[PDB]
Amino acid sequence: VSGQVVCVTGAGGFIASWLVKILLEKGYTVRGTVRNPDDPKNGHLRELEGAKERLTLCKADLLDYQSLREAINGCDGVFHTASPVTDDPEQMVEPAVIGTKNVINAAAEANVRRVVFTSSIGAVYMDPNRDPETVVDETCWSDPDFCKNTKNWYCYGKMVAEQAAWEEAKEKGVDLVVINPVLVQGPLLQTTVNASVLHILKYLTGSAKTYANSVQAYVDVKDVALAHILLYETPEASGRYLCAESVLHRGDVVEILSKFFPEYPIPTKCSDVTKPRVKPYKFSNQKLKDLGLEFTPVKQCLYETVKSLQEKGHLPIPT
């Protein structure tokens, strides 16, 4: 793997920082794109093992095609992870969809071996019709109008970006593999708190006063990073890959948190118990397991998320 060069888009982000860290540990040369290499929020990347010799931070934006050409030039592979993470369609849609087309086109011109695209469970799950008992897997796609009508614009953007990626890759003859993570937790390498981790932080700060009657899937950030690498490196990898460890009710989540962190104002009350407690849905992560990926149990992952938030100043012990 020595002498191999890969681009990671949006390299200073939550998932991408772990991806860059592990790529460098494995011996890769990495060209990580960030909007401003001199911004202190990217400083953690420079301090990674191997970064001094093998990490270049390339100034780029998803909507600046030439900047992407410069970053991707000479790469063997591209991990396209950069995206807005927002339900504001004015912020979400163009960098997701046009940005993704731009990345695939730059990768095609650079003659890269493979692109791995970070999609989401949001591109898989959000289908009104799908029977509740059906196993959620890679054959499932979300309903766009439904995402649109429910103002799930983040899910819409990820889905349409994924569709654009397949379409453009097909047209340009690019080997594309897609990973679809569920909600990602784990320790943060970066200084700020990204969207997925806010979902845990709100319980520890007590800004969340109750927990909803709902379930969703969780996965550890280190597993997600390893999975991106596994999809790049395995010649036979093909299509989409659901990346998820287990599904938990929010009630289960706050129980785990409150047992680990009894000093914090984690909510104990369900928002609304008018309906029976929602049961975890069935899913398959067999595709990734079949490639050898082992998933870290969610409890460990949640614990490490809070310890990280504490280290980084976000959770002083209450008085």
We find the least distance from the C-beta atom of residue 21 to ligand NAP, in angstroms, to be 13
The residue count for the chain: 319
Q: Which of 194, 246, 271, 284 binds ligand NAP (CB under 6 A)?
A: 194
The one segment of 83-91, 132-140, 145-153, 265-273 that binds ligand NAP by CB under 6 A? 83-91
Which pair of structure tokens corresponds to residue 293? 């990926």
Give the nearest distance from C-beta 6 to ligand NAP in angstroms: 16
Nearer residue to ligand NAP within complex by CB, 29 or 180: 180
Q: Is 247 in the site for ligand NAP (CB under 6 A)?
A: no
By beta-carbon proximity to ligand NAP, the closer residue of 200 and 315 is 200
Residue 256 is a binding residue for ligand NAP (CB under 6 A): no
∠ CA 258-280-206, rounded to 5°: 25
Chain-centre distance of CA 38, in angstroms?
24
Strand partners, 270: 211
How many whole angstroms separate alpha carbon 236 and alpha carbon 270?
45
- Active-site entry in 21, 52, 59, 158: 158
Nearer to ligand NAP, 37 or 50 (CB): 37
Rounded least distance, CB 45 to ligand NAP, Å: 11
Residue 92 touching ligand NAP (CB under 6 A): no
Residue 147's identity, in one-letter code, is: C
Minimal distance, residue 232 CB to ligand NAP, in Å? 15
Q: In a 3-state reduction of DSSP, which class is residue 29?
A: strand
One residue of 24, 72, 82, 174 binding ligand NAP per CB under 6 A: 82
**Nearest to ligand NAP of 157, 251 (CB atom):** 157
Nearer to ligand NAP, 220 or 252 (CB): 220
Q: What is the DSSP string of 140-203?
A: ----HHHHHHTT-HHHHHHHHHHHHHHHHHHHHT--EEEEEE-EEES--SSSS--HHHHHHHHH
Q: List Cα–Cα distances, 221 to 23, 108, 206, 213, 248, in angstroms.
A: 14, 28, 24, 25, 17
Q: Which residues ranging from 17 to 36 are in contact with ligand NAP (CB under 6 A)?
A: 35
Q: Which two tokens stand for residue 181?
A: 């993570």
Tokens (6 digits) for 260: 């680990």
Take residue 166 and report the two structure tokens written for it.
């397949």
61 binds ligand NAP (CB under 6 A): yes
State the catalytic residues. 158
**Which residues of the shown chain bind ligand NAP in the complex (CB under 6 A)?**
10, 12-16, 35, 61-63, 81-85, 95, 99, 118, 120, 158, 181, 183-184, 194, 196
